[PDB]
Structure formats: C-alpha cells, structure tokens
C-alpha cells in the first residue's frame, strides 16, 4: 500500500535526550530532560505532518488545530514504539530509558505505568512499523479538535488513512480479518494516556520549578 510506504519513508530520524552529565540526578533534572526532548520532537513532528497526503492542503488554522489536539498522542506513540522490545522500561530516547525506579524518582509512576499498558497491548498484537506509522497519522487526523474550519476535508484525510490501514491489513494479515479494527480499538487508551500526560505536565508548568521551552509551552497551553 502506497500511503503506508510513504509514511515509512517520511518517518523522521530519532533524536537524543542528552541529559546534562554535570547535573545531579533529581526529579527536576528528569523532567527538564523530558520537556527539552519533547520541545525538539515537536519541531520534528510539525515537519513530518507536512508529508501526510492532504495535510498541507488544509488551511493553516486547521493544520494548527490538528497538531494542537494530537501532539501528545504522537509523542506517546513514539515512546511506545521504541519500547516494544523492552520489558517494563520506556525508551524516551536511546540515551534515556526509564525503568520503574526512575519513574518513581521523576514522579511519573502512574503516567509511565499507563504508557507501559499501551506497550503491553501492542506487544501482544505484534505491532509492526507499517501499522505504527499509519496509526500515528490516523491519531493526527482523528484528533477531535473543536475548532475545525473544513470538517469535510478533515474527514477525507481520516478516510484516506483509514483506507490505507484497512488495505494494509487485508493484504498482510488475511489470518485476522478484524486486525484493522483491533488497531483502531487501541486509540482510546492512547487518547486517555495523552490526556493524563498533558494534565500532569501542565501541573508541572504551573508549579514553576521545571524550565520549559517555548514550543512545548505553546502546545501545552493550547490543550488546556
């Protein structure tokens, strides 16, 4: 399927967390590192979205609305995917892998446990890269922004990506004629986990102890 092949080639290079080796380990260090990484990933996500067939033909306001609604789901899906061959650890980046103990220290035990639940589900389904990239695009298109100008164009973008998923599954997974639907049925937990992450980091923002860069702040403010 061509849309799937295109999404695979459009998949961005990974980036490094680069935690500051001169700074003592603390909750503030961990959270600063993650927020800094997210800020840089957000730049990469914006560039990636322009490769999705039809996205750039939407008005700028609608492009903004989709990204404002979906950004954390896209970030989370990336962590989930990188974590699939790991056990009880989350690969935020190749140089930043959080186990349970580190999650507790960062005050992220509940959030990271929910992300691990998504990992566990996809592990059991043997999620493939083809399926990952297609679901990332579907999460963007299906992000439920209240502010869409051209609802019919957004529905068509949803349709295009949904068709690519169904087609991929029909060709590659004849053994399970419901596999496309099972993939779509993982989106509620992704949405739930994203909401949790957004609310947690917004609280962190309000508390004022973790410095945050401007893009990350902009995207956080737009969501709450």
């Amino acid at each position: 399927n061509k849309i799937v092949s295109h999404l695979l080639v459009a998949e961005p290079e990974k980036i490094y967390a680069m935690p500051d080796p001169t700074v003592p380990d603390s909750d503030i260090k961990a959270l600063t590192t993650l927020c800094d990484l997210a800020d840089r990933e957000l730049v990469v996500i914006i560039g990636w979205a322009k490769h999705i067939p039809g996205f750039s033909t939407l008005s700028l306001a609608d492009q903004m609305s989709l990204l404002q609604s979906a950004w954390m789901e896209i970030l989370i899906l990336g962590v989930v995917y990188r974590s699939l061959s790991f056990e009880d650890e989350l690969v935020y980046a190749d140089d930043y892998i959080m186990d349970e103990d580190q999650s507790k220290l960062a005050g992220l035990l509940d959030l990271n446990n929910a992300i691990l639940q998504l990992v566990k589900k996809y592990k059991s389904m043997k999620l493939e890269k083809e399926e990952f990239v297609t679901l990332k695009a579907i999460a963007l298109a299906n992000s439920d922004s209240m502010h869409i100008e051209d609802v019919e164009a957004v529905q068509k973008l949803q349709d295009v990506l949904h068709e690519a998923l169904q087609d991929y599954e029909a060709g590659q997974h004849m053994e399970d004629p419901r596999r496309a639907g099972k993939m779509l049925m993982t989106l509620p937990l992704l949405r739930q986990t994203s909401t949790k992450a957004v609310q947690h980091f917004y609280n962190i923002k309000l508390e004022g102890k973790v410095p945050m860069h401007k893009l990350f702040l902009e995207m956080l403010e737009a969501k709450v």
Binding site: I46, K50, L60, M64, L67, Q68, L215, E218
Partner: peptide, 10 residues
C-alpha cells in the same frame, strides 16, 4: 505564533 511559524517555514 511558533507553531504557525514552523508550519509556514521552508
């Protein structure tokens, strides 16, 4: 404005 800037960029 930053999201908008980046969407317009390159």
């Amino acid at each position: 404005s930053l999201l908008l800037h980046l969407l317009k960029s390159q």
